């Protein structure tokens, strides 16, 4: 796989792991999103250090107001925080 292709298939398979066992086959749930993001980004993203922080994200992703997160919602989330990291990385150069 190419560097970019490498990253596309990764988000798609890891999401299948939590989403198809502790929840709906093709849909995520309030507890599945928290587990997927924290397990590998526990110390990074703001989740466990701020249980409230996970809730702010669901609100932003609860666009349908379904109380669940679709792969179209989750992928939008990881994509938007990493970009914020590059901008705050140049603040201290």
């Amino acid at each position: 796989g190419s560097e970019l292709e490498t990253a596309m298939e990764t988000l798609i398979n890891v999401f299948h792991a939590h989403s198809g066992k502790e929840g709906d086959k093709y849909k995520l749930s309030k507890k599945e999103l928290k587990d997927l993001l924290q397990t590998e980004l526990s110390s990074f993203l703001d989740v466990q250090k701020d249980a409230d922080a996970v809730d702010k994200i669901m609100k932003e992703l609860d666009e349908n107001g379904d109380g669940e997160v679709d792969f179209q919602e989750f992928v939008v989330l990881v994509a938007a925080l990493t970009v914020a990291c590059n901008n705050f990385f140049w603040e201290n150069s």
Partner: peptide, 12 residues
């Protein structure tokens, strides 16, 4: 607040 990170809130 240092003991905790509110960066994701940056998104909101």
């Amino acid at each position: 607040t240092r003991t905790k990170i509110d960066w994701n809130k940056i998104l909101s």
